[PDB]
Coordinates of all heavy atoms in Angstrom, one line a residue:
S56 N 14.5 22.7 70.9 CA 13.1 22.6 70.5 C 13.0 22.3 69.0 O 12.3 21.4 68.6 CB 12.3 23.8 70.8 OG 12.2 24.0 72.2
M57 N 13.9 23.0 68.3 CA 13.9 22.8 66.8 C 14.4 21.4 66.5 O 13.8 20.8 65.5 CB 14.8 23.9 66.2 CG 14.5 23.9 64.7 SD 12.9 24.6 64.4 CE 12.7 24.1 62.7
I58 N 15.4 20.9 67.1 CA 15.9 19.6 66.8 C 14.9 18.5 67.3 O 14.7 17.5 66.6 CB 17.3 19.4 67.5 CG1 18.3 20.4 66.8 CG2 17.8 18.0 67.4 CD1 19.6 20.5 67.5
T59 N 14.4 18.7 68.5 CA 13.5 17.7 69.1 C 12.2 17.5 68.2 O 11.8 16.4 68.0 CB 13.1 18.0 70.5 OG1 14.3 18.0 71.3 CG2 12.2 17.1 71.1
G60 N 11.6 18.6 67.8 CA 10.4 18.5 67.0 C 10.6 17.8 65.7 O 9.8 17.0 65.2
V61 N 11.7 18.2 65.0 CA 12.0 17.7 63.7 C 12.4 16.3 63.7 O 12.1 15.4 62.9 CB 13.0 18.6 63.0 CG1 13.6 18.0 61.7 CG2 12.5 20.0 62.7
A62 N 13.2 15.9 64.7 CA 13.8 14.6 64.8 C 12.7 13.5 65.0 O 13.0 12.3 64.8 CB 14.8 14.5 66.0
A63 N 11.6 13.8 65.5 CA 10.5 12.8 65.7 C 9.6 12.7 64.6 O 8.6 11.9 64.7 CB 9.7 13.2 67.0
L64 N 9.8 13.3 63.4 CA 8.9 13.2 62.3 C 8.9 11.8 61.7 O 10.0 11.2 61.5 CB 9.3 14.2 61.2 CG 9.1 15.7 61.6 CD1 9.4 16.6 60.4 CD2 7.7 16.0 62.1
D65 N 7.7 11.3 61.4 CA 7.5 10.0 60.8 C 7.3 10.1 59.3 O 7.4 11.2 58.8 CB 6.4 9.3 61.5 CG 5.1 10.0 61.4 OD1 5.1 11.2 61.1 OD2 4.0 9.3 61.6
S66 N 6.9 9.0 58.7 CA 6.7 9.0 57.2 C 5.3 9.5 56.9 O 5.0 9.7 55.7 CB 6.9 7.6 56.7 OG 6.8 7.6 55.2
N67 N 4.4 9.7 57.9 CA 3.1 10.2 57.6 C 3.1 11.6 57.0 O 2.3 11.9 56.1 CB 2.2 10.1 58.9 CG 1.8 8.7 59.2 OD1 1.8 7.8 58.4 ND2 1.5 8.5 60.5
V68 N 4.0 12.4 57.5 CA 4.1 13.8 57.0 C 4.4 13.8 55.5 O 3.9 14.6 54.7 CB 5.1 14.6 57.8 CG1 5.0 16.1 57.4 CG2 5.0 14.4 59.3
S69 N 5.3 12.8 55.0 CA 5.6 12.7 53.6 C 4.5 12.1 52.8 O 4.6 12.1 51.6 CB 6.9 11.9 53.5 OG 6.7 10.6 54.1
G70 N 3.4 11.6 53.4 CA 2.3 11.0 52.7 C 1.4 12.1 52.0 O 1.6 13.3 52.2
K71 N 0.5 11.6 51.3 CA -0.4 12.5 50.5 C -1.3 13.3 51.5 O -1.5 14.5 51.2 CB -1.3 11.6 49.6 CG -0.6 11.3 48.2 CD -1.3 12.1 47.1 CE -1.1 11.4 45.8 NZ -1.1 12.3 44.6
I72 N -1.7 12.7 52.6 CA -2.5 13.4 53.5 C -1.7 14.5 54.2 O -2.1 15.6 54.4 CB -3.2 12.5 54.6 CG1 -3.8 11.3 53.9 CG2 -4.2 13.2 55.5 CD1 -4.9 11.6 52.9
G73 N -0.4 14.1 54.6 CA 0.5 15.0 55.3 C 0.9 16.2 54.3 O 1.0 17.3 54.7
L74 N 1.2 15.8 53.1 CA 1.6 16.8 52.1 C 0.5 17.9 51.9 O 0.8 19.1 51.8 CB 2.0 16.2 50.8 CG 2.2 17.1 49.6 CD1 3.7 17.5 49.5 CD2 1.8 16.3 48.3
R75 N -0.7 17.4 51.8 CA -1.8 18.3 51.6 C -2.0 19.3 52.7 O -2.3 20.5 52.6 CB -3.1 17.6 51.3 CG -3.3 17.1 49.9 CD -4.6 16.5 49.6 NE -4.6 15.0 49.7 CZ -4.5 14.2 48.7 NH1 -4.4 14.7 47.4 NH2 -4.5 12.9 48.9
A76 N -1.8 18.8 54.0 CA -1.9 19.6 55.1 C -0.8 20.7 55.1 O -1.0 21.9 55.4 CB -1.9 18.8 56.4
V77 N 0.4 20.3 54.8 CA 1.5 21.2 54.8 C 1.3 22.3 53.7 O 1.6 23.5 54.0 CB 2.9 20.4 54.6 CG1 4.0 21.4 54.3 CG2 3.2 19.6 55.8
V78 N 0.8 21.9 52.6 CA 0.6 22.9 51.5 C -0.5 23.8 51.9 O -0.4 25.0 51.7 CB 0.2 22.1 50.2 CG1 -0.4 23.1 49.2 CG2 1.4 21.4 49.6
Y79 N -1.6 23.3 52.6 CA -2.6 24.2 53.1 C -2.1 25.2 54.1 O -2.4 26.4 54.0 CB -3.8 23.4 53.7 CG -4.7 24.2 54.5 CD1 -5.7 24.9 53.9 CD2 -4.6 24.2 55.9 CE1 -6.6 25.7 54.7 CE2 -5.5 24.9 56.7 CZ -6.5 25.7 56.0 OH -7.3 26.4 56.8
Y80 N -1.3 24.8 55.0 CA -0.8 25.7 56.1 C 0.2 26.7 55.5 O 0.3 27.8 56.0 CB -0.2 24.9 57.2 CG -1.2 24.2 58.1 CD1 -1.1 22.8 58.2 CD2 -2.2 24.9 58.7 CE1 -2.0 22.1 59.0 CE2 -3.1 24.2 59.5 CZ -3.0 22.8 59.6 OH -3.9 22.2 60.4
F81 N 0.9 26.3 54.4 CA 1.7 27.3 53.7 C 0.9 28.4 53.1 O 1.2 29.6 53.2 CB 2.6 26.6 52.7 CG 3.3 27.5 51.7 CD1 4.5 28.1 52.1 CD2 2.7 27.8 50.5 CE1 5.1 29.0 51.2 CE2 3.3 28.7 49.6 CZ 4.5 29.3 50.0
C82 N -0.2 28.0 52.4 CA -1.0 29.0 51.7 C -1.7 29.9 52.6 O -1.7 31.1 52.4 CB -2.0 28.3 50.8 SG -1.2 27.4 49.4
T83 N -2.2 29.4 53.7 CA -2.9 30.3 54.7 C -1.9 31.2 55.4 O -2.3 32.3 55.7 CB -3.8 29.5 55.6 OG1 -3.0 28.4 56.2 CG2 -4.9 28.8 54.9
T84 N -0.8 30.6 55.8 CA 0.2 31.5 56.4 C 0.7 32.6 55.4 O 1.0 33.7 55.9 CB 1.4 30.6 56.9 OG1 0.9 29.7 57.8 CG2 2.5 31.5 57.5
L85 N 0.9 32.2 54.2 CA 1.4 33.2 53.2 C 0.4 34.3 53.0 O 0.7 35.5 52.9 CB 1.6 32.5 51.8 CG 2.1 33.4 50.7 CD1 3.4 34.2 51.0 CD2 2.2 32.6 49.4
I86 N -0.9 34.0 53.0 CA -2.0 35.0 52.9 C -2.0 35.8 54.2 O -2.1 37.1 54.1 CB -3.3 34.3 52.7 CG1 -3.4 33.6 51.4 CG2 -4.5 35.4 52.7 CD1 -4.4 32.6 51.2
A87 N -1.8 35.2 55.4 CA -1.7 36.0 56.6 C -0.5 36.9 56.7 O -0.6 38.0 57.2 CB -1.8 35.0 57.8
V88 N 0.6 36.4 56.1 CA 1.8 37.2 56.1 C 1.6 38.5 55.3 O 1.9 39.6 55.7 CB 3.0 36.4 55.6 CG1 4.1 37.3 55.1 CG2 3.5 35.5 56.7
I89 N 1.0 38.3 54.1 CA 0.7 39.5 53.3 C -0.4 40.4 54.0 O -0.2 41.6 54.0 CB 0.2 39.0 51.9 CG1 1.3 38.2 51.2 CG2 -0.2 40.2 51.0 CD1 0.8 37.3 50.1
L90 N -1.4 39.8 54.5 CA -2.4 40.6 55.2 C -1.9 41.3 56.4 O -2.2 42.5 56.5 CB -3.6 39.6 55.7 CG -4.7 40.3 56.5 CD1 -5.4 41.4 55.7 CD2 -5.6 39.2 57.0
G91 N -1.0 40.7 57.2 CA -0.4 41.4 58.3 C 0.5 42.5 57.9 O 0.5 43.6 58.5
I92 N 1.3 42.3 56.8 CA 2.2 43.4 56.3 C 1.4 44.5 55.8 O 1.7 45.7 56.0 CB 3.1 42.8 55.3 CG1 4.2 41.9 56.0 CG2 3.8 43.9 54.5 CD1 5.0 41.1 55.0
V93 N 0.3 44.2 55.0 CA -0.5 45.3 54.3 C -1.1 46.1 55.4 O -1.2 47.4 55.3 CB -1.5 44.6 53.4 CG1 -2.6 45.6 53.0 CG2 -0.8 44.1 52.1
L94 N -1.7 45.5 56.4 CA -2.4 46.3 57.5 C -1.5 47.2 58.3 O -1.7 48.4 58.5 CB -3.2 45.3 58.4 CG -4.5 44.8 57.8 CD1 -5.0 43.6 58.7 CD2 -5.5 45.8 57.7
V95 N -0.3 46.6 58.7 CA 0.6 47.4 59.5 C 1.2 48.5 58.7 O 1.5 49.6 59.2 CB 1.6 46.5 60.2 CG1 2.6 46.0 59.2 CG2 2.3 47.1 61.4
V96 N 1.5 48.2 57.4 CA 2.0 49.3 56.5 C 1.0 50.4 56.3 O 1.3 51.5 56.2 CB 2.6 48.6 55.3 CG1 2.8 49.7 54.2 CG2 3.9 47.9 55.5
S97 N -0.3 50.0 56.0 CA -1.3 50.9 55.7 C -1.7 51.7 56.9 O -1.8 53.0 56.9 CB -2.5 50.2 55.1 OG -2.1 49.2 54.2
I98 N -2.1 51.0 58.0 CA -2.5 51.7 59.2 C -1.4 52.5 59.8 O -1.5 53.6 60.4 CB -3.1 50.7 60.2 CG1 -4.4 50.1 59.6 CG2 -3.5 51.4 61.5 CD1 -4.7 48.7 60.2
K99 N -0.1 51.9 59.8 CA 1.0 52.6 60.4 C 0.7 52.9 61.9 O 0.7 54.1 62.2 CB 1.5 53.8 59.6 CG 2.3 53.5 58.4 CD 2.6 54.8 57.6 CE 1.4 55.6 57.2 NZ 0.4 54.8 56.4
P100 N 0.5 51.9 62.8 CA 0.1 52.2 64.2 C 1.1 53.1 65.0 O 0.6 54.0 65.6 CB 0.0 50.8 64.8 CG 0.8 49.9 63.9 CD 0.7 50.5 62.5
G101 N 2.4 52.8 65.0 CA 3.4 53.5 65.9 C 4.2 54.5 65.1 O 5.4 54.7 65.5
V102 N 3.6 55.2 64.2 CA 4.3 56.1 63.3 C 3.9 57.6 63.7 O 2.7 57.9 63.7 CB 4.0 55.9 61.8 CG1 4.4 57.0 60.9 CG2 4.7 54.6 61.3
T103 N 4.9 58.4 63.9 CA 4.7 59.8 64.3 C 3.5 59.9 65.3 O 3.4 60.9 66.0 CB 4.5 60.7 63.1 OG1 4.8 62.0 63.4 CG2 3.0 60.6 62.6
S104 N 18.5 48.7 50.0 CA 17.9 48.1 48.9 C 17.1 46.8 49.2 O 17.5 46.1 50.2 CB 18.9 47.8 47.8 OG 18.3 47.4 46.6
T105 N 16.1 46.5 48.5 CA 15.3 45.3 48.7 C 16.1 44.0 48.3 O 16.0 43.0 49.0 CB 14.0 45.3 48.0 OG1 13.4 46.6 48.2 CG2 13.1 44.2 48.4
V106 N 16.9 44.1 47.3 CA 17.6 42.9 46.8 C 18.6 42.5 47.9 O 18.8 41.3 48.2 CB 18.3 43.2 45.4 CG1 19.0 44.5 45.4 CG2 19.2 42.0 45.1
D107 N 19.4 43.5 48.4 CA 20.4 43.2 49.4 C 19.7 42.6 50.7 O 20.2 41.7 51.3 CB 21.2 44.4 49.8 CG 21.9 45.0 48.6 OD1 21.4 44.8 47.5 OD2 22.9 45.7 48.8
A108 N 18.5 43.1 51.1 CA 17.8 42.6 52.3 C 17.4 41.2 52.1 O 17.5 40.4 53.0 CB 16.7 43.5 52.6
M109 N 16.9 40.9 50.9 CA 16.5 39.5 50.6 C 17.7 38.6 50.4 O 17.7 37.4 50.9 CB 15.6 39.4 49.4 CG 14.4 40.3 49.4 SD 13.4 40.0 50.9 CE 12.6 38.5 50.4
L110 N 18.8 39.1 49.8 CA 20.0 38.3 49.7 C 20.6 38.1 51.1 O 21.2 37.0 51.4 CB 21.0 39.0 48.8 CG 20.6 38.9 47.3 CD1 21.9 39.3 46.5 CD2 20.1 37.6 46.8
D111 N 20.5 39.1 52.0 CA 21.0 38.9 53.4 C 20.2 37.9 54.1 O 20.7 37.2 55.0 CB 21.0 40.3 54.1 CG 22.1 41.2 53.7 OD1 23.1 40.7 53.1 OD2 21.9 42.4 53.9
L112 N 18.9 37.8 53.8 CA 18.1 36.7 54.4 C 18.6 35.3 54.1 O 18.7 34.5 55.0 CB 16.6 36.9 53.9 CG 15.5 36.6 54.9 CD1 15.7 37.2 56.3 CD2 14.2 37.0 54.3
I113 N 19.0 35.1 52.8 CA 19.5 33.8 52.4 C 20.9 33.6 53.0 O 21.3 32.5 53.4 CB 19.6 33.7 50.9 CG1 18.1 33.9 50.3 CG2 20.1 32.3 50.5 CD1 18.0 33.8 48.8
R114 N 21.7 34.7 53.1 CA 23.1 34.6 53.7 C 23.0 34.2 55.1 O 23.7 33.4 55.6 CB 23.8 35.9 53.5 CG 24.3 36.1 52.1 CD 25.3 37.3 52.1 NE 25.4 37.8 50.7 CZ 24.8 38.8 50.3 NH1 23.9 39.5 51.0 NH2 25.0 39.3 49.0
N115 N 22.1 34.9 55.9 CA 21.9 34.5 57.3 C 21.2 33.1 57.4 O 21.4 32.5 58.5 CB 21.1 35.6 58.0 CG 21.9 36.8 58.3 OD1 22.9 36.7 59.1 ND2 21.5 37.9 57.8
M116 N 20.5 32.7 56.4 CA 19.9 31.3 56.4 C 21.0 30.3 56.4 O 20.8 29.2 56.9 CB 19.0 31.1 55.2 CG 17.5 31.2 55.6 SD 16.5 31.5 54.2 CE 16.6 29.9 53.4
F117 N 22.2 30.6 55.9 CA 23.4 29.7 55.9 C 24.5 30.5 56.5 O 25.4 31.0 55.8 CB 23.7 29.2 54.5 CG 22.5 28.6 53.8 CD1 21.7 29.4 52.9 CD2 22.1 27.3 54.1 CE1 20.7 28.9 52.3 CE2 21.0 26.8 53.4 CZ 20.3 27.6 52.5
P118 N 24.6 30.5 57.9 CA 25.7 31.2 58.5 C 27.1 30.6 58.2 O 27.2 29.4 58.0 CB 25.4 31.2 60.0 CG 24.5 30.0 60.1 CD 23.7 29.9 58.9
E119 N 28.1 31.4 58.2 CA 29.5 30.9 57.9 C 30.1 30.2 59.2 O 31.1 29.5 59.0 CB 30.4 32.0 57.4 CG 30.1 32.4 56.0 CD 31.0 33.4 55.5 OE1 31.6 34.2 56.3 OE2 31.2 33.5 54.2
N120 N 29.6 30.5 60.4 CA 30.1 29.8 61.6 C 28.9 29.6 62.5 O 28.1 30.5 62.8 CB 31.1 30.7 62.2 CG 31.9 30.1 63.4 OD1 31.6 30.3 64.5 ND2 32.9 29.3 63.0
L121 N 28.8 28.4 63.0 CA 27.7 28.0 63.9 C 27.8 28.7 65.3 O 26.8 29.2 65.8 CB 27.6 26.5 64.1 CG 26.9 25.7 63.0 CD1 27.0 24.2 63.3 CD2 25.5 26.1 62.9
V122 N 29.0 28.8 65.8 CA 29.1 29.5 67.1 C 28.8 31.0 67.0 O 28.1 31.6 67.8 CB 30.5 29.2 67.7 CG1 30.8 30.1 68.9 CG2 30.6 27.8 68.1
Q123 N 29.4 31.6 66.0 CA 29.1 33.0 65.7 C 27.6 33.3 65.5 O 27.1 34.4 65.8 CB 29.9 33.6 64.6 CG 31.1 34.3 65.0 CD 31.9 34.8 63.8 OE1 31.4 34.8 62.7 NE2 33.1 35.3 64.1
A124 N 26.9 32.3 64.9 CA 25.5 32.5 64.6 C 24.7 32.6 65.9 O 23.5 33.1 65.8 CB 25.0 31.3 63.7

Side-chain angles (χ1 to χ4, degrees):
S56 296
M57 195 69 194
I58 294 171
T59 297
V61 170
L64 293 182
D65 62 342
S66 187
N67 286 336
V68 192
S69 55
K71 276 250 207 206
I72 313 302
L74 167 92
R75 280 188 261 261
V77 169
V78 167
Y79 164 80
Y80 288 123
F81 166 85
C82 292
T83 52
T84 300
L85 178 59
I86 297 161
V88 160
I89 297 158
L90 172 63
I92 289 170
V93 162
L94 282 168
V95 73
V96 164
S97 317
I98 297 158
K99 281 175 306 301
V102 164
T103 204
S104 191
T105 312
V106 47
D107 303 24
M109 306 306 284
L110 289 194
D111 285 339
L112 215 47
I113 305 181
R114 283 194 202 92
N115 283 297
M116 256 163 72
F117 309 97
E119 285 182 339
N120 190 261
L121 279 176
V122 167
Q123 258 180 15

